[PDB]
Amino acid sequence: ITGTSTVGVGRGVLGDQKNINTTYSTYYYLQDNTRGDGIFTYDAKYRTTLPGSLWADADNQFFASYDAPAVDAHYYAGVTYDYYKNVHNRLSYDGNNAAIRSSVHYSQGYNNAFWNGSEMVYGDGDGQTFIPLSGGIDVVAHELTHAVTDYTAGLIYQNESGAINEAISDIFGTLVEFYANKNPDWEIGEDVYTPGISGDSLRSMSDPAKYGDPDHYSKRYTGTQDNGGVHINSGIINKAAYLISQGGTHYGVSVVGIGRDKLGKIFYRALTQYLTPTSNFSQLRAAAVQSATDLYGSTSQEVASVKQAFDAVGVK
Numbered sequence: 001i002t003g004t005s006t007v008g009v010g011r012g013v014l015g016d017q018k019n020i021n022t023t024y025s026t027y028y029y030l031q032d033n034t035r036g037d038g039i040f041t042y043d044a045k046y047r048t049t050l051p052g053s054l055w056a057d058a059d060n061q062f063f064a065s066y067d068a069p070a071v072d073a074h075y076y077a078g079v080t081y082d083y084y085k086n087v088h089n090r091l092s093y094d095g096n097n098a099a100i101r102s103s104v105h106y107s108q109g110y111n112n113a114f115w116n117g118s119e120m121v122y123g124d125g126d127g128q129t130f131i132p133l134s135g136g137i138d139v140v141a142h143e144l145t146h147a148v149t150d151y152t153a154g155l156i157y158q159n160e161s162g163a164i165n166e167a168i169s170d171i172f173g174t175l176v177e178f179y180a181n182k183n184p185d186w187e188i189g190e191d192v193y194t195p196g197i198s199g200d201s202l203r204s205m206s207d208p209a210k211y212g213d214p215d216h217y218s219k220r221y222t223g224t225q226d227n228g229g230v231h232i233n234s235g236i237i238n239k240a241a242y243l244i245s246q247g248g249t250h251y252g253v254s255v256v257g258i259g260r261d262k263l264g265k266i267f268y269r270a271l272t273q274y275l276t277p278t279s280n281f282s283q284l285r286a287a288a289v290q291s292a293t294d295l296y297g298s299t300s301q302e303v304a305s306v307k308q309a310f311d312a313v314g315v316k
């Protein structure tokens, strides 16, 4: 809507207070005009029609229970925008400052979040397996990264290209988490997963196996569940990414870590310049090696570490 840019304050899912960019026109709307062509957060009001209504609030204060998932969807999308802009010189998910839209309070007891081709969508969780999913910045950044991927590589969402698609979202969701720097980890979803159990997570990049995901190509899933295992076989790439960044010896293969920033540079380059809708794990390895080579030279440590990492996960 048309209005004047304002700053409101609220409490997120985890009870943390934050300021948020809003727009004033009779009501205060969750519309951030400070980034690209705007960030817009909607109320789906527990139904599944999208996007629902642009979030309207009478006084610019957002401390109601009902407001918290909105506060975080809105804020963490702003942080994710900032990451891609400042760190990769990318303007929004299409690179041309497309409006970023999110809807929260989707459906009832809904344990998922997704990119629907046009916007981000967050369920509130059933309060057992999940709390409102926008409460985790790695979740928000995972979702917005699905938009980035669809506008760039276009990785089809099934089988190996689908596993790569998922891994890219976990990788950048994690790099954004570290970018915001509030107790970052190499785990996925820990902030909104199983409120009753501390210490766990939906996935682990450091040790995928912890939650039944493969950490070696020889262990990949080839059945048909989960689109040919997109959230399962992503463990193999997540592990490889972890290794490139943090190093380690995995099944006897030693990897010298090169750090998170170089990991991000390499995978961002592979994503936007070399992967295609049907890339498989072997072609991602070549893409990662060629990207590292572009960035640091064929005789670099960086290239050598990428190869070590894919060797360690059994991807040639």
Ligand SMILES: CCC(=O)Oc1c(C)cccc1C(=O)O
Pocket (backbone or CB within 6 Å): 111, 112, 113, 114, 133, 138, 139, 142, 143, 173, 188, 189
């Ligand atoms: C880290 C965010 C995530 O994985 O969200 C999903 C959930 C919670 C359920 C089903 C699919 C997804 C997804 O984004 O792929």
Ligand SMILES: [Ca+2]
Pocket (backbone or CB within 6 Å): 057, 058, 059, 060, 061, 062, 063
């Ligand atoms: Ca209010």
Ligand SMILES: [Ca+2]
Pocket (backbone or CB within 6 Å): 138, 174, 177, 184, 185, 186, 187, 188, 189, 190
């Ligand atoms: Ca995390």
Ligand SMILES: [Ca+2]
Pocket (backbone or CB within 6 Å): 190, 192, 193, 194, 195, 196, 197, 198, 199, 200, 201
């Ligand atoms: Ca938990």
Ligand SMILES: [Zn+2]
Pocket (backbone or CB within 6 Å): 142, 146, 166, 169
């Ligand atoms: Zn995903």
